Amino acid sequence: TPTVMVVDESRITFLAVKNALEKDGFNVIWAKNEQEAFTFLRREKIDLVFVDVFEGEESLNLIRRIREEFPDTKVAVLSAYVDKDLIINSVKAGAVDYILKPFRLDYLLERVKKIIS
Amino acid sequence: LTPTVMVVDESRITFLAVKNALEKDGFNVIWAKNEQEAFTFLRREKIDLVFVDVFEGEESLNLIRRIREEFPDTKVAVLSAYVDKDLIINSVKAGAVDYILKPFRLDYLLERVKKIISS
Numbered sequence A: 001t002p003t004v005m006v007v008d009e010s011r012i013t014f015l016a017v018k019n020a021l022e023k024d025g026f027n028v029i030w031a032k033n034e035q036e037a038f039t040f041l042r043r044e045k046i047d048l049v050f051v052d053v054f055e056g057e058e059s060l061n062l063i064r065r066i067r068e069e070f071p072d073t074k075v076a077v078l079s080a081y082v083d084k085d086l087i088i089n090s091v092k093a094g095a096v097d098y099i100l101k102p103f104r105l106d107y108l109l110e111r112v113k114k115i116i117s
Numbered sequence B: 001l002t003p004t005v006m007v008v009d010e011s012r013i014t015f016l017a018v019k020n021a022l023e024k025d026g027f028n029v030i031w032a033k034n035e036q037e038a039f040t041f042l043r044r045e046k047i048d049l050v051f052v053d054v055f056e057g058e059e060s061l062n063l064i065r066r067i068r069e070e071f072p073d074t075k076v077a078v079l080s081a082y083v084d085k086d087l088i089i090n091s092v093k094a095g096a097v098d099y100i101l102k103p104f105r106l107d108y109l110l111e112r113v114k115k116i117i118s119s
Helices: A011-024 A034-043 A058-069 A084-093 A105-115 B012-025 B035-042 B058-070 B085-094 B106-118
Strands: A003-007 A027-031 A048-051 A074-079 A097-100 B004-008 B028-032 B049-053 B075-080 B096-101
Touching: A003 A011, A003 A034, A011 A027, A011 A105, A027 A034, A034 A058, A048 A058, A058 A074, A058 A084, A074 A084, A074 A105, A084 A097, A084 B085, A084 B096, A097 A105, A097 B085, B004 B012, B004 B035, B012 B028, B012 B106, B028 B035, B035 B058, B049 B058, B049 B106, B058 B075, B058 B085, B075 B106, B085 B096, B096 B106
Parallel strands: A003 A027, A003 A048, A048 A074, A074 A097, B004 B028, B004 B049, B049 B075, B075 B096
Antiparallel strands: none
């Protein structure tokens, strides 16, 4: 079963993602920070990581770091904030998708399905 | 240094707008009304930046990728009448480094272009 990791300070973001993917053949895990995210990436296979974007280039640096250290792990952005430059820079950093919060559970599920082979 | 900027767009109005926004600031702006004309130019002179109108959809994305593969030192930015999250994502994935809505402000285009030229 493919594993999806939600990197967000909010447990609720994790709950919503789990609600969308759980009964659809996906194992969802939660990392409240970058430190914790890397602890998991190093110990297990993680197919997709959702990163919360909004603050400076550090959010972009996390995307880059994940992509470089774990090339087999795809990264998608999940955020409430959305402007042209956030989208452009996150994809430049290596993100494969950019999904807005609040999201429809069925929309998230279909975007995830397109990302994970 | 005077960078060359090529506008690939059927619209002469768009070409003129880009020219007016960049000419006086040290940019050499040229016009290609279509893909064929764009490559005739690319095969003859080095182009620093190309603006591609993404109207034809996947054909436009196909063009961005072809320019990037054949002329890797050439930067590509999109000009579009519509802004869409997915269009933006796919454009950047194809190799575009910016996405600008048209009609655009002259000062805004100049600043974005300078930003693209720097790095």
